[PDB]
Amino acid sequence: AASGSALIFDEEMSRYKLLWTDPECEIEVPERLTVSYEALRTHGLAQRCKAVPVRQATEQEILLAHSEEYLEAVKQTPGMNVEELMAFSKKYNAVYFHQNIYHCAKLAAGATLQLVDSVMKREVRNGMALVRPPGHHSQRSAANGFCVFNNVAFAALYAKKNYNLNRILIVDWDVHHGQGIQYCFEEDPSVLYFSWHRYEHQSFWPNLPESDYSSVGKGKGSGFNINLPWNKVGMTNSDYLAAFFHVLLPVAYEFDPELVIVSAGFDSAIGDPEGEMCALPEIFAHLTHLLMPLAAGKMCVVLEGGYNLTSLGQSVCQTVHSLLGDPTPRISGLGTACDSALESIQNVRNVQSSYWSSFKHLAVRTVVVPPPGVELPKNCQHSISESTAKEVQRIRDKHFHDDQNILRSLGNIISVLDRMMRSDEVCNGCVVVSDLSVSVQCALQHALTEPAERVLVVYVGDGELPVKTNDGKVFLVQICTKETEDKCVNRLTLCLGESLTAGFMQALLGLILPVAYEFNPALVLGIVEELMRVWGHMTCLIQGLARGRMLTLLQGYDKDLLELTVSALSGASISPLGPKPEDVEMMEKQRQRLQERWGLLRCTVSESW
Ligand SMILES: NCc1cccc(C(=O)CS)c1
Ligand SMILES: [K+]
Ligand SMILES: [K+]
Ligand SMILES: [Zn+2]
Numbered sequence: 001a002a003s004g005s006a007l008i009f010d011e012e013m014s015r016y017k018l019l020w021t022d023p024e025c026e027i028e029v030p031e032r033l034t035v036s037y038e039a040l041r042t043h044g045l046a047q048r049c050k051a052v053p054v055r056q057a058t059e060q061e062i063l064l065a066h067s068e069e070y071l072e073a074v075k076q077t078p079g080m081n082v083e084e085l086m087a088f089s090k091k092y093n094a095v096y097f098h099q100n101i102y103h104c105a106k107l108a109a110g111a112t113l114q115l116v117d118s119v120m121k122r123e124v125r126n127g128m129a130l131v132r133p134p135g136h137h138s139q140r141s142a143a144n145g146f147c148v149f150n151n152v153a154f155a156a157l158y159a160k161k162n163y164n165l166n167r168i169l170i171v172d173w174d175v176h177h178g179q180g181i182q183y184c185f186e187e188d189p190s191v192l193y194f195s196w197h198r199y200e201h202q203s204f205w206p207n208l209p210e211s212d213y214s215s216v217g218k219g220k221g222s223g224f225n226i227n228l229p230w231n232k233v234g235m236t237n238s239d240y241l242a243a244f245f246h247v248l249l250p251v252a253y254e255f256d257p258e259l260v261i262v263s264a265g266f267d268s269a270i271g272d273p274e275g276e277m278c279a280l281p282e283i284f285a286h287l288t289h290l291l292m293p294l295a296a297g298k299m300c301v302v303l304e305g306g307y308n309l310t311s312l313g314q315s316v317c318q319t320v321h322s323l324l325g326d327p328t329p330r331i332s333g334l335g336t337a338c339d340s341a342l343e344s345i346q347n348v349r350n351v352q353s354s355y356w357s358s359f360k361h362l363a364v365r366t367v368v369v370p371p372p373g374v375e376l377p378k379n380c381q382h383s384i385s386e387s388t389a390k391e392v393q394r395i396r397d398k399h400f401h402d403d404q405n406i407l408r409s410l411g412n413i414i415s416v417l418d419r420m421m422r423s424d425e426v427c428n429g430c431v432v433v434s435d436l437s438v439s440v441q442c443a444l445q446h447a448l449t450e451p452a453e454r455v456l457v458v459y460v461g462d463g464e465l466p467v468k469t470n471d472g473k474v475f476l477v478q479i480c481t482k483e484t485e486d487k488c489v490n491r492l493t494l495c496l497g498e499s500l501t502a503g504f505m506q507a508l509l510g511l512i513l514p515v516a517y518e519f520n521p522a523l524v525l526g527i528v529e530e531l532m533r534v535w536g537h538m539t540c541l542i543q544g545l546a547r548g549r550m551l552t553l554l555q556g557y558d559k560d561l562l563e564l565t566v567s568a569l570s571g572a573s574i575s576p577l578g579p580k581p582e583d584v585e586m587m588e589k590q591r592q593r594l595q596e597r598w599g600l601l602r603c604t605v606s607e608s609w
Contacts, residue, residue, distance in 0.1 A: 001122075001572070002122040002124055002125045003125055004050050005050070005124055005126050005128070005320065006049060006050045006051075006114075006119070006124040006126075006127030007040070007045075007049035007051055007127065007130070007320070008052045008053070008111045008114050008115050008127065008128070008129040009033070009046075009054070009111075010053070010111070011033075012054075012103075012104065013054075013108060013133075014132065015030070015100050015104065016030065016100040016132075017030050017098065018096045018098075019082050019085065019086075019096070020082070020086055022096060025094065025095070027274060027307040028307065029307075029309075031309055032306065032307065033130055035309045035310075035313050036313055036316045038313070039312075039313030039317050040313075040316060040317060040320055045321065048324055049320070049323075050118075050124055052115070052123075053114070054110055054111040054114060055107070055110035055113070056106040056110045057106045057110040057113060057149070059071070061109070061158065062106070062109065062149060062154075064154060064157040064158065064161065065149070065153045066138075066140055067141045069141065070140070070141040074102050074105070074143070074149075077097050077098075077101065077102050078099055080099070085097045085099070092142055092143045092144060093144055093145070093206075094144065094205065095145065095148070101133065101148060104132060104133065105148035105149045106149075108134075108135065108148075108149070109151050111129045111151075112129050112131060112151040112152065112155045113154060113158050114129070115127045115155070115300045116158055116259075116300055117162075119298050119299070120159060120162075120298070125297050126292070126297055126298065126299040126301070126323045127323070128264070128301040128303070128316075128323060129151075129301070129302045129303065130303050131151055131302060131303050133146055133147055133149075134146055134265065135147045135149055135150040135180070135302075135304070136150060136152055136178030136181050136265070136304050137176065137179060137180050139179070139180040139183055140183070144179075144180065145176060145206065147180065150181060151302055152170060152172075152178070152261055152302050152304075153180065153185070155261045155300055156170060156261055160190060160191075165190070165258045165259055166258065167190060167192070167256060167257045168191045168257055168258065168259045168261060169192050169252055169255060169259070169261070169294065170185075170192065170261045171252075171260065171261070171262050171263065171291060172194065172196075172263035172265070173195075173240075173263070173287060174197070174263055174264070174265020174267060174268060174304040174305045175197060175198045175230075175267040175268035175274060175275035175277060176197055176205065177195050177199070177208065177211040177229075178193075178195055178304075179208055179211060181195070181263065182195070182215065182225050185221065185225070186218045186219075186221055186225060187219040187221040188224065189220050189221045189223075189224045192225075192226070192252075192255050192257065193224065193225050193226070194248050194252075195226070195228070195263075196227075196228040196229075196230060196240075196243055196268070197211060197228070197230065198230045198233065198268075198274075198275060198276070199211060199229030199230055200231055200233070211229060213227055213228065213347045213351055214351060216351055216352060223354070223356065224355075226248075228243055228247060228345065228348050229344055230340070230344065232341075234276065234277060234278050235268075235279065235338070235341060236278045237278075237279050237280060237282075237333075237334060238334050238335050238336065238337050238338075238518075239337045240279050240287065241286070241331075242336075242337035242341060242345060242602070243337075243341070243345065245509055245513055245517075245600070246345055247345055247348060247349060249290060249509045249513075250356070250505075250506060250509050250510060251356050252291065252294055253294065253505055253509065253577065254356060256576050256578055257294055257295050258295055259295050259298050259300065260291055260298065260300070261299075261302065262291070262300065262301040262302060263302060264284075264301045265304030265305030266284065266305065266312050266315040266316065267307055269306065269312070269314075271308040271310065271311040272311060273307060273308065274305070280331075281311055281314035281315035281317075281318045282318055282329045282331060283331065284322075285319065286328055288319050288322045288323060289322045289328050289541075289544050290544065292322070292540070293540045293541060293574040295576065296574065296575060296576060297573040301323065325365075327543075327548040328543070328547065328548065330520055330545070331520065334517050334518040334520065335518060335599045335600060336600060336606075337602065339606075342602055342604060346605055349361075357579065361604075364379065364380070364381050364425060364426050364427075365380065365426070365427045365428065365570055366380045366426070366429060366566060366570045367380070367381055367382070367383060367416050367429040367430075368381070368382060368429070369382065369383045369416065369431040370432055370557070370562065371557050372408075374432075374557065376566070377566065377570045377572065380566060383412050383415060383416065384408075384411045384412070389411060391414055391446075392410055395410070399441070403435075406435050406438065409431060409432075409439060410438065410442045412431050413431055413439060413442050413443050413446065413551070413553075417443065417447055417551060420523070421450045421451060421452055421522075421549065427547075427548045427549060428543070428550040428551065428569045429552070429569070430551075430554065431552070431553055432553075432554045432556075432557055432562065433554070433555055434555065434556075436529065436553070437466050439553055440466055440467065443553065444467055444525060447522075447525065447551070451522070452521075452522035452523045454474070454475070454519060454521045454522055455473065455474050455475075455522065455524075455525055456475050456516050456521035456523070456524045456525070456545060456546070457476045457527065458479075458525065458542060459477070459478045459479070459527040459529075460479040460480075460526075460529065460535075461478075461479075461555075462480050462529065463529070464484075465478075465527065470488060472490065474490065475490050475491070475521070476492070476493075477492045477494075477515070477516070478491070478494070479494050479507075480493060480494070480495050481495060482495060483495045483586075486590060489594065489597050492512065492590060492594060493590075494507050494511070494590065496580075496583045497580065499580045499583070500531065500580075503580060503583035503584070504538075505534065505537070505577065506579060506583075507583075507587050508534075510587065510591070510603075511590060511591060511594075511601065512538075513542075514598065515594065515598045515600070516545050517544070517545065517600060518598050518599070518600040520545070521546050522546050522549070523549050524542050524543075524546050524549070524551070525550075525551055525553070526539065526550060526552035526553065527552075527553045528552070528553070534577075535561065535565060535568065536567065536568040536575070539565060539569060540574050550569065
């Protein structure tokens with residue numbers, strides 16, 4: 001098992017800049033790299049990463065995605081003066097050249113290949129390449145949009161050639177549309193390319209009709225190119241998360257990529273002069289976290305855009321924070337996506353439904369408390385105090401009047417919760433219990449007693465659990481076998497077999513996560529009554545809430561389920577996964593029941609009365 005994150009950066013890619021007046025290219029400055037790395041240094045993130053050195057991409061590696069005529073023309077630019085460089089730059093659109101840019105372009109490409117080699121050789125779990133110039137706009141025989149060579153298209157073709165990868169997922173969250181990547185893998189069904197981008201009904205650069213939602217791919221690649229056009233500026237965190245939940249993640253998990261490559265352009269963040277969006281840098285901590293269960297965590301984040309020399313460093317730090325497994329920050333104020341974003345999401349879902357059936361529509365980190373003497377990852381530890389025992393005796397004499405082991409388990413619940421909420425010494429925990437009712441009441445009430453306003457309960461089992469949801473401070477997601485209808489607005493009951501896994505995955509991405517993210521709980525309470533081999537992806541993705549503070553209760557000892565739950569809470573890589581009509585009908589009925597209160601469930605524009 002690989003560990004650690006690779007950080008590939010070199011100050012040499014800062015040794016080229018614009019040498020003439022060009023208001024279109026004035027934003028792409030060398031200070032973008034320096035501010036980024038210095039931000040990672042100030043927060044101590046760069047030191048926690050393995051600094052894999054950069055290298056030059058060879059001529060054959062560059063020819064994987066570019067023609068010999070274009071490579072030879074760029075190869076001649078190191079010998080040009082400023083006048084010849086300006087004329088050469090004028091031959092292309094929205095790009096400038098420099099005596100050192102060909103060198104730096106080969107360094108940006110090689111740095112990306114170094115990142116791919118590091119992740120694929122299991123030398124690191126994931127990694128980021130702070131490179132310059134960006135790449136996602138450059139095409140086979142043209143420089144375009146500040147880009148010389150397509151570093152991400154290099155990574156995918158390099159991974160296919162040198163690792164026999166059949167499925168790669170490219171996620172381009174740069175605010176511009178990487179048309180170079182789309183062109184490269186237009187007919188390629190092995191490289192699924194997703195891209196949201198400021199479009200404004202084709203009025204924004206690069207002003208391409210094939211940047212619209214209607215471009216799904218050509219030939220055998222139909223359905224493996226997904227464009228989400230933002231037609232209004234000011235897209236928020238809710239717009240981005242709705243894009244992931246209702247477009248990207250369901251297709252990504254069904255695709256099951258063997259490698260995830262991120263065209264990480266942070267011009268889609270708040271404050272950037274080009275994107276003009278309103279997504280906080282914290283959203284990128286979640287954008288990568290929601291993708292980390294894919295490809296066993298093998299993620300290659302590659303820098304593209306981002307031109308606000310303040311939000312860029314903050315967004316880079318948030319992305320590295322999540323790559324290192326640090327607890328994701330809580331996102332508040334989430335709600336429905338705006339009408340323009342819902343229109344875009346609905347349009348891309350409809351056109352992609354012919355290729356992904358889930359879009360069709362009707363007309364110490366972890367503390368472990370096993371049973372006494374059960375007898376563990378290096379970032380885990382075991383478990384009482386005088387105040388804990390006195391509180392347990394008070395709860396017993398008050399509510400549970402008239403067993404030493406169960407009372408000991410309740411004391412473990414209290415100590416684990418006190419160590420999770422009242423300090424940063426422990427992030428999450430898992431406890432094996434016997435009596436469910438008493439343990440659930442103690443966990444929930446003590447969690448609400450300590451500073452935890454809202455609690456997201458995730459109970460997998462049948463029967464009614466002692467948890468009142470008619471107050472707003474608790475939301476119950478119950479994965480059961482029998483149907484209990486759905487009355488309370490604070491209760492999402494799902495009663496989903498072979499397709500059960502996929503149905504649960506669809507219900508997790510399209511219902512559970514949007515509700516949980518808008519709910520923004522201070523603690524997640526997982527309960528499993530005595531199939532559940534999707535718990536790892538559930539536990540990993542549910543850790544995006546409450547700064548990862550999750551307490552799991554397991555009724556009955558299951559060495560497989562206990563080890564899986566501890567592995568997921570500790571942050572180890574999640575193994576990949578490789579849909580009944582009654583299940584999707586029950587899911588959409590639950591959506592129609594709850595989307596009025598939880599607008600993040602909406603993937604279609606609402607029809608007014
Ligand atoms: N509006 C200027 C412009 C033109 C082309 C590309 C870009 C990027 O930012 C690419 S990341 C900006
Ligand atoms: K994009
Ligand atoms: K494709
Ligand atoms: Zn961009």
